[PDB]
Amino acid sequence: AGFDRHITIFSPEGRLYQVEYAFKAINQGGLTSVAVRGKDCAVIVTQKKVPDKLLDSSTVTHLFKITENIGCVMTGMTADSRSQVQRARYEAANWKYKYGYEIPVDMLCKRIADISQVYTQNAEMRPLGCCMILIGIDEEQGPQVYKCDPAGYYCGFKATAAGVKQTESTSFLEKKVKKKFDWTFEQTVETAITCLSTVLSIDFKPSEIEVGVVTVENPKFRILTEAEIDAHLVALAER
Amino acid sequence: VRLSGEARKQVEVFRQNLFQEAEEFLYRFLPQKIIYLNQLLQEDSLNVADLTSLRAPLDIPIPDPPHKCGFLPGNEKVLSLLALVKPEVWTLKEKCILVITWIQHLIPKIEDGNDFGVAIQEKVLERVNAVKTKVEAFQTTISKYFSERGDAVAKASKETHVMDYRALVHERDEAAYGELRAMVLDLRAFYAELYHIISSNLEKIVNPKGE
Amino acid sequence: VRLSGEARKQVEVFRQNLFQEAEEFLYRFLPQKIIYLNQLLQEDSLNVADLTSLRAPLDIPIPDPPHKCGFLPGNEKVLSLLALVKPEVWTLKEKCILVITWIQHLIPKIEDGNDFGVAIQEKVLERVNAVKTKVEAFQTTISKYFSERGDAVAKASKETHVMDYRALVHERDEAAYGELRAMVLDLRAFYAELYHIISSNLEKIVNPKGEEKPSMY
Amino acid sequence: TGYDLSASTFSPDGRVFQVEYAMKAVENSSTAIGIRCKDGVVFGVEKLVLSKLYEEGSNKRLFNVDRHVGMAVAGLLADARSLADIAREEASNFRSNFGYNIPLKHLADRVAMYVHAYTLYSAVRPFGCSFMLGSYSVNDGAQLYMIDPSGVSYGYWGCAIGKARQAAKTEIEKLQMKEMTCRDIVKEVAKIIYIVHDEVKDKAFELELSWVGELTNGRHEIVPKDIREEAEKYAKESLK
Amino acid sequence: SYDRAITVFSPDGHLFQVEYAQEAVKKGSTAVGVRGRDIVVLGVEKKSVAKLQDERTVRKICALDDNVCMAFAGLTADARIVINRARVECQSHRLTVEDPVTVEYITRYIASLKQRYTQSNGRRPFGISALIVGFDFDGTPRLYQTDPSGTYHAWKANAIGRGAKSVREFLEKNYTDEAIETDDLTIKLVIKALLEVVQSGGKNIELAVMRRDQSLKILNPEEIEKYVAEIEKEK
Amino acid sequence: MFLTRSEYDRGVNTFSPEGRLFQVEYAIEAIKLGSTAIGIQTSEGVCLAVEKRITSPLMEPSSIEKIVEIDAHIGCAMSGLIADAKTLIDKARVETQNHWFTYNETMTVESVTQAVSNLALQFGEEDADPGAMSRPFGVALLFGGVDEKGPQLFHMDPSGTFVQCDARAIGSASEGAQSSLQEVYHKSMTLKEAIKSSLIILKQVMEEKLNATNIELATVQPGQNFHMFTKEELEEVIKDI
Amino acid sequence: QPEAQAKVDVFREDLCTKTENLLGSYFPKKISELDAFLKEPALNEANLSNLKAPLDIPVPDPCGPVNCNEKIVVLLQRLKPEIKDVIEQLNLVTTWLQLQIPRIEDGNNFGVAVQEKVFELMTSLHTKLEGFHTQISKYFSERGDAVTKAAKQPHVGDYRQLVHELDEAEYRDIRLMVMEIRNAYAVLYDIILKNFEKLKKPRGETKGMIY
Amino acid sequence: VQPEAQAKVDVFREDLCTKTENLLGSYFPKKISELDAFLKEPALNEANLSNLKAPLDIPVPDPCGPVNCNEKIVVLLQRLKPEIKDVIEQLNLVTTWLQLQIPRIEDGNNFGVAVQEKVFELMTSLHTKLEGFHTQISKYFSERGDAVTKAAKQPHVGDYRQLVHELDEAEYRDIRLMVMEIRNAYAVLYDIILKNFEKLKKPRGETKGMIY
Amino acid sequence: FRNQYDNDVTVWSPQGRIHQIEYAMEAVKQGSATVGLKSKTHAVLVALKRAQSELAAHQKKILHVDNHIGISIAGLTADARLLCNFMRQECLDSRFVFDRPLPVSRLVSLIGSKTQIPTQRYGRRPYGVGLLIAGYDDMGPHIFQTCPSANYFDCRAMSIGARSQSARTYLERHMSEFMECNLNELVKHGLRALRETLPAEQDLTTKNVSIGIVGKDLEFTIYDDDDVSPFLEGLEERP
């Protein structure tokens, strides 16, 4: 063949197989992340797996804060994830400097995604093998959830997942939105945790998951403590 | 192509039966065959230490130096070993055919890229075809034993003066015993290698082009 | 793997025997064989000019135009030259076997780098294996000579009327002498070629990976 | 398969194999370990003596990347020295601009991003070094970080790199570093290195140790030779 | 193996792409040059009119300056570029040193340009060889030749392009001090040499002369017809 | 038994196994295509000679310039690619004149040879300048000049390595011409004897019979400057032989 | 079902124990034994006139029992167990190596390549050894045919010479075969010992924390 | 050890070098001359093969006497066989010479080795053809004997008569082409070696060195 | 096969080895041998020079960088000349800026960085030359070696080039006495050490030996063919 092995060249069917391989690179990590939106809150959950006891559990995280009121969860290569996180933080601060107001979540996602496009069009560099999911509150639009992928697609979502169990998780979430009644903050967090736990079969403990939330009442992105996570987990088991 | 309802049903039942049989062979029949071949190897008849013991009695009159030949039977020992091994040989050939067609049905539509899965599938079916040709060679040798021993015995009876034909008949029996024991061993090895390859590469074999 | 002391001693004995035998072969046996073979070639037995002289009388009773055959001997000249050449063939085969074992024991543990010496080693192995196949073909021809002359003489005696079977018998003997001279000079050539390749490439063959280098690590 | 030739490429199954091949580089290296305790961080390296000719205190794998941080490396020494120059430049720039000693987490992040730059582009190979960084500051505390050739960075209570990583990691695991103090940790680091050293394959080693902590007033420094000799004698005694 | 890049040497040290460009020169139309005592004559064959084409657009012979002219055999576009570059260099040299260019200076410049394109990959050699004629300050006639490789050599008389071997053998035979004695004899010599390799005489040769202190003159087709008639009659 | 894979010879900046860097070696093979040149260093001076290898009679003999003048004190003889030879000769000339400009003195033959050698080294492309030929210079030079140390003859090769040599031959018949040099040469010989011996060797190696046209000869002596033997002087010596 | 994997893993552990025992004890012992046997005076004979065996056919101016060459059959009788042994051990190490081949992947295919190199050597050895098996039967059959030809045509003497030549060729081939079997054990031991780490663990875990 | 062993092999090598040089100088040209002379002779080139037809004395149906070989073909074959033996011997000599001249393996600068490889391929092809001729002679004798025996066993079958005649004619034209091929083999071998002698003799070339 | 992974420096091998760097390290073996050894008061460099022919002069194997530093080369003379120019300019810059002799350790660090840059990038080859650097500074006498790989070592003594293992073993068995030696004893030891590398037929001469000495009172001086005769005369004979 040879139509793979370079991002620039098109297949005879015009598919650009290299970026599709970058999509597989996300699943190679073996972790899953889920994001679900609510009427007044947006949450991100992801597996936290510590391979060795010696590792400091505090340092390992896939949840990062792009700015005070935006948070992200990265899935894929850890290094590419950290690099994209840094680029996102730079883009947000530069937006604030130039335009005088906090970057919208959609525009941040668009900037990061079009950067991913310049990666998937120029020859020498490779697409970053990571996926981003951004959550924030916009005053006009309420909560928001968005996802960047290695291709440059940046579509917004009511709820999403990324990682190895993405298809199972989106099947689960699709059923839940179809039986739409609402999602308050507690139900939002419960839906996220139930989705992740059901698709993985994990039956989590508080250490195994890390959750981050935004709410219209408290717009700042915060990563909940193990105690708060256990509080939500116990509520799930009780009912 | 327009697909009749009955035609769709026929193709679906074939595919279903094939995949069911593949799972059954891999997980139930194959280990049972491995343990069977293990115990067959452990049997005393198949681990005879002294090959001169199975040297058959060939009764043809030594010519007096300067009358007629009675019935000369075949070696019961090697015949019994053949009775044991030959079913296993043909059984492995059949199951090899099953695995080959199962893999071929799992091969997806041809596309330009993401072809590493089909490459893995092609590698596995290449090994399976190699196992099948070795098995067919065992069948050829099993067929050859009778004709070769008959030629040798007939030549010895026709030419009683030459003793080397009698020595040859005894050698044919010994070589047959060795070959049959090797056949049992490598049948077990082929079964195990098929399990190893398929189990190791099952994810790509069943799902080559990613999702 | 757990190795007994007796096992280690046995393996060491095989290794030292192989290595000293290879040294002895290359440096003592091979030149001695070259001088012996060129003396054989210079000898008149292998230097016959008129090959019709080699023809041996084939006593078959020619039929009258319109008795049992005696003992028909083989061509003594050819048989003597066969007696000379055949041990040389077998010895060259044996020494090729020794050389392949020597080199195969010399090749290093497999590694990604420093592969050029290993390439030289395996290339030399391939060439000596080719020489081995050639001498195997030679001994096959040696057997073919006896079988072919025998069936030719039998057919000539059975069909006494056809002369061309007798001509074939003489032709087989003549071709045999020619092929056997070719065989012995080829044997000398094979010995010299073995020495040339091994001597010229000896440093890489003996020490493929080379001297230890300062660590990058 | 041409997928493994370059780092720009992806495998069809989503793997960048050049980076993994570079990760295999460090395993060629002799082991090095760093352990973090309450007082500070201790580093240790098993520096194999390739020849008697080489001077002692040469081929140092323990570098000082700033006054308050030290670096221990495994993998290609050339790439490691270059990475140390990069880290020193980053620390100096941080001091010059922001006016104070660089936080270790930030320094690890910057050098990790510099490393991660190389995995992307086709023109340039990934680094062949994996290195540990450690510092003590009264504000931040004891911190130990390890950077792989990929640019992944994490904080480790105890860490090992090189050939004997796994064995060193189990030995470190059975230690309870959090309660302990540095002057004991040097002895246990010596014990672990002497354990993991293979006398048959590796002819000899000279233990190279360093630490940073309150006992230094937050300066990474090479161990005083008396303490080195005490730890080495203890390690030889425990080895039996 | 070793013929795909200009930079790479071959075993035995042959640079083969420049040889291929020298071969490309052989495809081109013939050109011939001869040094008379007071004339330098430059003759070039004409491929064909095609009967719907304007001859003025296609001219192999060109004047770099008042005192220098060239003819080329090889890639026509490359020849046009090289001619323009040499012309601007001529005027620049006059600008810089307040003197007219010498023939060896301009052939050195053209050779240096061709050499510059050979040395570096990412650029292909100019697929031309040229015949540069001029009169120096002393008034001596000068004829030089250049090739894609970038070597230049003076020639008493020479040819380039297709049939160069045959016509130069003829010229080695014919050329002598006697032939150069007369300007008409020089013109007739070059005309006979081109006649050695050309389909038809008058129609398919374009010829020009430079005199001691006169500009280039492309001889009229009637004048060429008269000269070939004189050549034809003498035989 | 033939192993001809090479697969590393193509492309400079590739160390082949055993680390031989074969492009430079092929460039060193390239000068054997060139005409033979010969140099002898003596106390009375250094002489240089070369065979012109005239292709056709119509070509002007003077135009072939395989011996040239870097300056009055130093001359050069070259064998190999005429074009890159011209480049290196230009470098030598400009460096000599730069030295005169800056220090008001004449360069030594060793310093001039080092100056051109530095340019030859740049095929490695360590410098970022675009205007440096990627290929090595496919020419060998013989630098002969009288300096503060007296007559000196330096040899330069495509690698850029340079050495003093009492007598050297470059080009096609350098093998064999060097053996003849080794037997004939003795340090005490005068320049007349050196001229005669070098012309003997050139006559031996040259395919065509030696004539004043097909050779170029030069000498630089301590009192004199670089001098080329004219047609008449060449006629006298080639008659004397 | 993991019971099949359990059975195949038990089989693989058994093969690993067996091949380790082989490399440790059996291969050195057989190397020493075969070296002693080739050093034995029996197959080192200075003059083959002793090897020559009688032919009872009468010369012309119905033949008696023409016995086989006692020396050659004795040497063959002790030879053929060695060939059978080395072939069996080769098959065992071959199946052990086959079960150690890892999952197919497009990277980290070193160690796998090491396994392929060991495999090609083992394949060459297997072909040579089964060639020896074939050659013994060829000797018996060819000598019998030559003796029959001589008896049918006593006037022909070239058949007499053919029988004697087959005998001496077989003796020399037995000597070379013993050398081959010793060398096969030795080189197999050397290769396996040198590369055992990669052969046992071709790939390892290179994933780490890239992803 | 054994610099004396290297000396002995070097003596053999020098003998092969001087022998192949003398061979190329004298033997190959004169053999080309001799073989074209043999082609020009009327015995090898005949207008009609009816002349070549030799008597088959079998009696036709409405025990045979000695049926002799085709004397013309036999005489021409006796002329041919020395040439085959000679050319095979000289080819073996030059092949051994080229094999000895193969240099030490080097990772690069193997073009000189490649020339030797191509010339060696040509020599190998020639060797195969010549061996084929030597076998073809015995094939002719065996086939003619088989056909004569079949005719005698079945006199009614005339096609065996035509078969013996056809085999004789085929062998005559075959030996004509064979003599042509011996001549051409000598000529082409000479041409290859003479054209490529410099590289064959000295493949690596002088190690100019001085890079180190 | 594995012909791949050898083409360029920028390609890692499946077992973590950059083969082009190793192929460059082979280059030092090609050159003529060199030996360096030090005492408490002196550092010495000694070399075996090679000549293209009898008429040609022997090549220059020892080069002076500064009064306090000088080098000896094994491997490509081109790379040697380039690196020597770089080192000379660095020392000149140090003297101009700080008016102090450059520390030899710092100079070899600079050499290591400059040499390392080719190995990692596509383009320029690794410097296929091995240098022995010897100098006296305030800390004391020093000897370093630099490989074509940018790694460098500090040595009591070292030998680089063809057949240098013999010199290394001689040096190792005689090393203890070197430290207290006189300069004459030390140069004699080094001369015997390089004599080990020579062929048995060849012997040390005035022509093929060059000696380089630097010390507290002695600036770097290369003792040439005539000047090595005092040091050579002491040596007895081949064993």
Curated annotation (Swiss-Prot), chain B:
The keyword Phosphoprotein applies. Pfam families: PA28_C, PA28_N. Implicated in immunoproteasome assembly and required for efficient antigen processing. The PA28 activator complex enhances the generation of class I binding peptides by altering the cleavage pattern of the proteasome. InterPro entries: PA28_C, PA28_C_sf, PA28_N_sf, Proteasome_activ_PA28, Proteasome_activ_PA28_N, Proteasome_activ_sf. GO terms for biological process: regulation of G1/S transition of mitotic cell cycle; regulation of proteasomal protein catabolic process. It comes from Homo sapiens. The keyword tRNA-binding does not apply. GO terms for cellular component: cytoplasm; cytosol; extracellular exosome; membrane; nucleoplasm; proteasome activator complex; proteasome complex. The modification Phosphoserine is found at S4. This is Proteasome activator complex subunit 2. Heterodimer of PSME1 and PSME2, which forms a hexameric ring. Belongs to the PA28 family. Keywords: Acetylation, Phosphoprotein, Proteasome. Induction: By IFNG/IFN-gamma. One of its GO terms (molecular function) is identical protein binding.
Curated annotation (Swiss-Prot), chain E:
Coiled coil: none annotated. The 26S proteasome consists of a 20S proteasome core and two 19S regulatory subunits. The 20S proteasome core is a barrel-shaped complex made of 28 subunits that are arranged in four stacked rings. The two outer rings are each formed by seven alpha subunits, and the two inner rings are formed by seven beta subunits. The proteolytic activity is exerted by three beta-subunits PSMB5, PSMB6 and PSMB7. PSMA7 interacts directly with the PSMG1-PSMG2 heterodimer which promotes 20S proteasome assembly. Interacts with HIF1A. Interacts with RAB7A. Interacts with PRKN. Interacts with ABL1 and ABL2. (Microbial infection) Interacts with HIV-1 TAT protein. It comes from Homo sapiens (Human). It is found in: Cytoplasm; Nucleus. It comes from the Eukaryota. Glycans are attached at S129. Component of the 20S core proteasome complex involved in the proteolytic degradation of most intracellular proteins. This complex plays numerous essential roles within the cell by associating with different regulatory particles. Associated with two 19S regulatory particles, forms the 26S proteasome and thus participates in the ATP-dependent degradation of ubiquitinated proteins. This is Proteasome subunit alpha type-7. The modification N6-acetyllysine is found at K226. The modification Phosphotyrosine is found at Y152. Induction: Down-regulated by the ribozyme Rz3'X. Up-regulated in colorectal cancer tissues. SMART domains: Proteasome_A_N. GO terms for molecular function: identical protein binding. Transmembrane segments: none annotated.
Swiss-Prot record, chain H:
One of its GO terms (biological process) is regulation of proteasomal protein catabolic process. One of its GO terms (cellular component) is cytosol. Keywords: Proteasome. Induction: By IFNG/IFN-gamma. The keyword DNA repair does not apply. One of its GO terms (molecular function) is endopeptidase activator activity. InterPro entries: PA28_C, PA28_C_sf, PA28_N_sf, Proteasome_activ_PA28, Proteasome_activ_PA28_N, Proteasome_activ_sf. It holds the Pfam family PA28_C. Heterodimer of PSME1 and PSME2, which forms a hexameric ring. PSME1 can form homoheptamers. Implicated in immunoproteasome assembly and required for efficient antigen processing. The PA28 activator complex enhances the generation of class I binding peptides by altering the cleavage pattern of the proteasome. PANTHER family: PROTEASOME ACTIVATOR COMPLEX SUBUNIT 1, PROTEASOME REGULATOR PA28. Belongs to the PA28 family. This is Proteasome activator complex subunit 1. The gene is PSME1.
From Swiss-Prot, chain I:
SMART domains: Proteasome_A_N (SM00948). One of its GO terms (biological process) is negative regulation of inflammatory response to antigenic stimulus. It is found in: Cytoplasm; Nucleus. Glycans are attached at S109. It comes from the Eukaryota. InterPro entries: Ntn_hydrolases_N (IPR029055), Proteasome_alpha (IPR050115), Proteasome_alpha-type (IPR023332), Proteasome_alpha1 (IPR035144), Proteasome_asu_N (IPR000426), Proteasome_sua/b (IPR001353). Induction: Induced in breast cancer tissue (at protein level). Up-regulated in liver tumor tissues. Component of the 20S core proteasome complex involved in the proteolytic degradation of most intracellular proteins. This complex plays numerous essential roles within the cell by associating with different regulatory particles. Associated with two 19S regulatory particles, forms the 26S proteasome and thus participates in the ATP-dependent degradation of ubiquitinated proteins. This is Proteasome subunit alpha type-1. It comes from Homo sapiens (Human).
